Design a protein around this ligand. Structure first.
Ligand SMILES: *[C@@H]1O[C@H](CO)[C@@H](O[C@@H]2O[C@H](CO)[C@@H](O)[C@H](O)[C@H]2NC(C)=O)[C@H](O)[C@H]1NC(C)=O
Ligand SMILES: CCCCCC/C=C\CCCCCCCC(=O)O
Ligand SMILES: *[C@@H]1O[C@H](CO)[C@@H](O)[C@H](O)[C@H]1NC(C)=O
Ligand SMILES: *[C@@H]1O[C@H](CO)[C@@H](O)[C@H](O)[C@H]1NC(C)=O
Ligand SMILES: *[C@@H]1O[C@H](CO)[C@@H](O)[C@H](O)[C@H]1NC(C)=O
Ligand SMILES: [Zn+2]
Ligand SMILES: [Zn+2]
Length: 155
């Protein structure tokens, strides 16, 4: 139900700006949704953005979302639907990924999300991710990967 979050917890300005791929989660969600692209524009503590997800019945849907960042945490709001709308805590910060944790409606007991800068991250990045997870009391063991976007390092 909880990780053991870091010492500092520092989340800097524009740090989330631009393009991400949500390829790994614990609760594996990649039956409910697939091929998640995020794009965020920074407006101080506010981000506004697009999430292009694929649905196993509906299409290539798109969603408008905004972050509101408060130090270690942010609030995530999606316009069209609200099952991932919750507070999320930053667990790890890296040039090639961020890890967040929350208790949204879709997983009240806890949801870990890895956002990658690359769609198919190289084995170096995965080894750092593995470290970040142990370092906050989760492990790649209980995470699923988005297999609809084949990646030899995420299998
Ligand atoms: C995953 O989503 C991406 C981008 O969100 C898809 O790429 C799009 O592919 C269509 C082809 O019909 C183009 O018209 C778009 O302009 C493309 N966008 C980009 C950024 O390339 C991609 O095809 C999707 N893949 C899966 C497996 O769902
Ligand atoms: C670098 C990460 C940016 C910050 C995003 C905040 C953390 C969690 C976002 C929740 C996304 C949940 C799923 C996305 C789309 C969907 O499943 O419908
Ligand atoms: C995002 O926008 C919503 C709707 O305008 C508003 O409730 C709030 O300021 C923002 N919330 C989050 C979670 O970013
Ligand atoms: C959805 O977005 C529109 C912006 O056109 C806004 O007026 C509406 O109240 C939003 N609400 C929800 C629940 O998504
Ligand atoms: C996800 O990726 C890692 C390799 O990066 C692997 O050890 C783990 O088993 C994968 N899980 C699934 C369910 O694909
Ligand atoms: Zn919690
Ligand atoms: Zn493969």
């Amino acid at each position: 139900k909880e990780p053991c979050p870091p010492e500092n917890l520092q989340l800097t300005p524009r740090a989330l700006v631009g393009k991400w791929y949500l390829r790994t989660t614990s609760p594996d969600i990649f039956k409910q949704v697939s091929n998640i692209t995020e794009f965020y524009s920074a407006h101080g503590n506010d981000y506004y953005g697009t999430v292009t997800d694929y649905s196993p019945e509906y299409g290539l849907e798109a969603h408008r979302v905004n972050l509101t960042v408060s130090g270690r945490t942010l609030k995530f709001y999606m316009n069209d639907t609200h099952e991932y709308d919750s507070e999320y805590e930053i667990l790890a910060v890296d040039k090639d990924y961020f890890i967040f944790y929350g208790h949204p409606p879709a997983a009240p007991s806890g949801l870990a999300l890895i956002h990658y800068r690359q769609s198919c991250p190289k084995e170096d990045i995965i080894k750092r991710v593995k470290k970040s997870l142990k370092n906050v009391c989760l492990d790649y063991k209980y995470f699923g990967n988005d297999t609809s976007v084949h990646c030899r390092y995420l299998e």
